RNA sequence: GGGUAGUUUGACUGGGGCGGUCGCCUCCUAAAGAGUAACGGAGGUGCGCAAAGGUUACCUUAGAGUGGUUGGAAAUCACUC
């Protein structure tokens, strides 16, 4: 059995058809879809505290399911007293089935558990179908336990879509039921 | 141990002294092969690396704009040029 995420089932069985009708696309897979979700977290203070970076990496692992990579400093800078090549950030890429499952978990479970959650700004679009927005308290995810955290942390989420514009991606996200603050 | 004796105590230098310089490497002067002077104009150097060497395989920056927890002009992430 090719086990399939419920999001993938929902997409393939409805969303393709509604978007074809709604945007008069000539051929079927002119329809937008999702290629990757990038979860990033920038801990510049890790240059003092290694525990911060280790905790962030581990908490990302529990949140998603796959291990993270610690990015390095592209350029040595003094304003943040950064030496080139130091460990500064940590990111995870989600694709395919894991991507769909994580987005389902997020939209239905973790966005609800945010303090004063009143939707998400439906305008954080880079003009090319890529939607990036932040979450300040990772504790919204029930996966991580409260006691073991060493410092409350946030993280940025970027959703990359095959769409050529923002309208297409916003329509796809709305069909997915993404709680945009509107 | 200058009581006594034998000697040394550089050169370049718009006179000599004083100052500065003395080997090697890069550019200009150098007039489109090479070479070419001045106390002409700007710099470096008396090392470093057990990989920062050898080879195989795979990747591509910086900048500007744009969307983003602290994050600000600028950190990390994504896209366009």
């Amino acid at each position: 059995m090719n086990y399939v995420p419920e999001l993938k089932k929902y997409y393939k069985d409805s969303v393709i058809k509604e978007l074809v009708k709604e945007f008069e696309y000539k051929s079927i897979m002119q329809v937008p879809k999702l290629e990757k979700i990038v979860i990033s977290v920038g801990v510049g203070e890790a240059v003092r505290n290694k525990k911060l970076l280790d905790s962030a990496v581990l908490e990302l692992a529990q949140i998603t399911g796959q291990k993270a990579v610690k990015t390095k400093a592209k350029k040595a800078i003094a304003g943040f007293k950064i030496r080139q090549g130091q460990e500064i950030g940590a990111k995870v890429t989600l694709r395919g089935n894991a991507m769909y499952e994580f987005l389902y978990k997020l939209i239905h479970l973790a966005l609800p558990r945010v303090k004063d959650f009143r939707g998400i700004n439906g305008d954080a679009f880079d003009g090319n179908g890529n939607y990036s927005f932040g979450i300040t308290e990772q504790i919204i995810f029930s996966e991580i336990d409260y006691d073991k955290i060493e410092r409350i942390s946030g993280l940025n989420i970027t959703i990359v879509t095959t769409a050529s514009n923002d309208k297409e991606s916003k329509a796809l996200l709305l069909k997915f039921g993404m709680p945009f603050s509107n």
Side-chain angles (χ1 to χ4, degrees):
Chain A
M1 183 177 177
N2 293 322
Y3 179 68
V4 54
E6 73 88 18
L7 258 187
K8 212 168 212 168
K9 289 193 311 182
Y10 184 28
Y11 175 92
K12 296 196 169 213
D13 78 351
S14 72
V15 183
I16 305 169
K17 268 81 73 181
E18 287 97 10
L19 273 298
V20 173
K21 274 71 176 179
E22 192 258 351
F23 281 144
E24 71 264 8
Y25 279 163
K26 282 175 190 150
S27 184
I28 169 166
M29 52 85 74
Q30 180 84 312
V31 158
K33 72 189 178 174
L34 301 172
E35 50 267 33
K36 57 164 178 301
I37 295 181
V38 185
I39 310 174
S40 67
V41 54
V43 58
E45 293 211 333
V47 71
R48 277 89 62 189
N49 193 351
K50 281 316 299 313
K51 179 262 289 180
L52 281 196
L53 183 50
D54 292 331
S55 45
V57 160
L58 267 296
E59 79 168 7
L60 264 49
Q62 285 100 25
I63 295 315
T64 77
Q66 63 186 9
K67 192 205 149 202
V69 285
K70 332 185 186 174
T71 50
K72 288 163 156 161
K74 291 192 152 183
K75 186 79 68 64
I77 206 63
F80 324 115
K81 58 129 167 186
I82 291 305
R83 183 180 63 83
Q84 159 176 357
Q86 291 174 309
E87 285 301 18
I88 286 186
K91 79 168 172 187
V92 178
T93 293
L94 289 147
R95 289 189 155 118
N97 281 29
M99 182 178 72
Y100 281 57
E101 182 272 333
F102 161 76
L103 184 144
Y104 180 37
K105 174 172 78 171
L106 167 58
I107 177 179
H108 277 58
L109 301 147
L111 284 168
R113 303 173 95 262
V114 194
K115 290 164 63 71
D116 296 7
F117 166 59
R118 48 180 63 259
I120 317 298
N121 164 39
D123 281 331
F125 290 82
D126 72 332
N128 298 262
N130 306 315
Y131 187 89
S132 303
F133 82 103
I135 276 171
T136 51
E137 287 84 3
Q138 85 266 20
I139 318 303
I140 62 170
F141 300 87
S142 166
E143 208 81 0
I144 173 167
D145 188 87
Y146 192 100
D147 81 344
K148 51 176 57 64
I149 70 190
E150 301 99 307
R151 177 200 57 77
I152 301 279
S153 48
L155 59 85
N156 300 306
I157 308 282
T158 296
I159 321 295
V160 192
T161 71
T162 58
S164 47
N165 62 71
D166 299 332
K167 171 157 306 313
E168 303 283 329
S169 302
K170 177 154 194 162
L172 170 51
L173 268 285
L174 284 172
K175 288 275 175 58
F176 275 143
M178 185 63 72
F180 293 110
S181 186
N182 286 323

